[model samples]
Target: AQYEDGKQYTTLEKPVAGAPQVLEFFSFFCPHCYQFEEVLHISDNVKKKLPEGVKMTKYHVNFMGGDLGKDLTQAWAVAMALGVEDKVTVPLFEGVQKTQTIRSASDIRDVFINAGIKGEEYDAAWNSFVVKSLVAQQEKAAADVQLRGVPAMFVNGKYQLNPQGMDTSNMDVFVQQYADTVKYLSEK
Candidate 1:
């Protein structure tokens, strides 16, 4: 295997407790990240690919600018608040990358509503102070990674997977390496 826990990716400065953690730092404004999201079918089947004792979450990065960037990143932060990450992830990507209709909060909210959340169901999640605060925290998290690119993957906070530069078609192999790395770490 090309990836062997400590050799391929460095260990976390502070490991997350319990089963290894897999985190993706992403941004809606990043076309590559959007492309990656489409390739993985992540919110659906990707979760199935995860082995037991692995937890995952996609944290939004707001490195880029504009209201769309802000709106989309905030949407990501709030998706969890609405209890709708699975339903919101892909459409959120499409809303920004494919539809290009996400110029405002309303457009972003409609993306959530289409994901089965009602207007009332999703009101507070849209700009909840708490959600935005978490979004800012995610932004800082991305910065501290010392890598600015989106679609970047991290395992147990120890390993950083830089697959954003490879051919978008090889996502399976990339993920295989990632999962294998985690599988190995979990054993150790």
Candidate 2:
């Protein structure tokens, strides 16, 4: 399945290799994404049970704060560019979800430091050409995808969930169904 490229949401350069891909579109400030994280982690384990090469990629949807959100998105872009995704992604999410005290670029920097990324390194990564390109890609994706809200997901680049069209109460079921859908697609 093919998705429209360069929409409001960031698009992957290609489909995940070996297994069907699960793409999560989320935001740091979104409570639903936080709640969904636990389930998503579990689904990772579940996906492992299905087959190898099944991977999940997360796109932090930037919609809450205007410039601030863009900056945070850039922070994530830097992490991806520097290949410190595991170090920065989850930690950033935890910082946002657990603490009410930190909420600015400095706060994000502090969180990066806490995650073992040095201040200078963080700055450098954030300013690198690759990071800037990723940020630009993210902005383009967000515009092209026509994203309306956060905590969305796409299965194999074909299916998508919109806030208005979804019922949150069935999130667990939806996640499992979504996973199953990917698994089924992978088999085909």
Candidate 3:
């Protein structure tokens, strides 16, 4: 049950060897993406189980939406480059989802400022050349993948697996599929 193929998942035409890349294409504004993060316990259920050399990267999807949506898309690149995602992410979601407190880029930045990231430092990181390049790359990959939805999972930059048509509400099914698919893909 590693992969179901043609339906459950698709193999990348151009697969890479030596190292495998697992990517999660997601959007902060998407409730399902958020639900996947919190509900799946991916770090424990998905990541901790990843075999040696199989690396996972989370990409914030650059989808057009409300002002806050676009800002969040950019802000994730900023957060990653500056090393504050670990600090600001959950709060960012909490503020928006729980409190509806983050209304604009200005409001979102305030969350960072409170997390000990000085406004000046955050500005430099947000506007840095590095951030722009990474953000653009993220957007390009999102387009290239052409998934029907966020929370899309891709392995080794080629194969898109689990949740392409998965139901996270069913944890038993969710955990077993990913646990099996990830191990099988990494080995083969």
Give TM-scores for every candidate, taking all chains together and pairing residue i with residue i.
Answer: 0.78, 0.72, 0.85
Choose the strongest candidate by lDDT: 3
lDDT of 3 at 120: 92
Model 3 misplacement above 4 A: 12-20, 164-173
What is the lDDT ranking, best to worst?
3, 1, 2
As a TM-score, model 1 comes out at 0.78
Name the lDDT value of residue 68 in candidate 3: 76
Query: Candidate 3, residues 32-137: lDDT per residue as tens digits?
Result: 7767676665544667778876777777875634677778877888898887777987888777777888888988899999998989988998888998887887
What would the per-residue lDDT of candidate 1 be over residues 8-56, giving only the tens digit for each residue? Answer: 4565565444322777777877887776678664433445566786667
Candidate 2: 10-residue stretch with minimal lDDT: 1-10
Worst 10 residues of 3 by lDDT: 12-21
Better of 1 and 2 by TM-score: 1
Please say which candidate is ahead in lDDT: 1 or 3: 3
lDDT value for model 1: 0.67
Give the root-mean-square deviation of each candidate in angstroms: 3.4, 6.3, 2.7
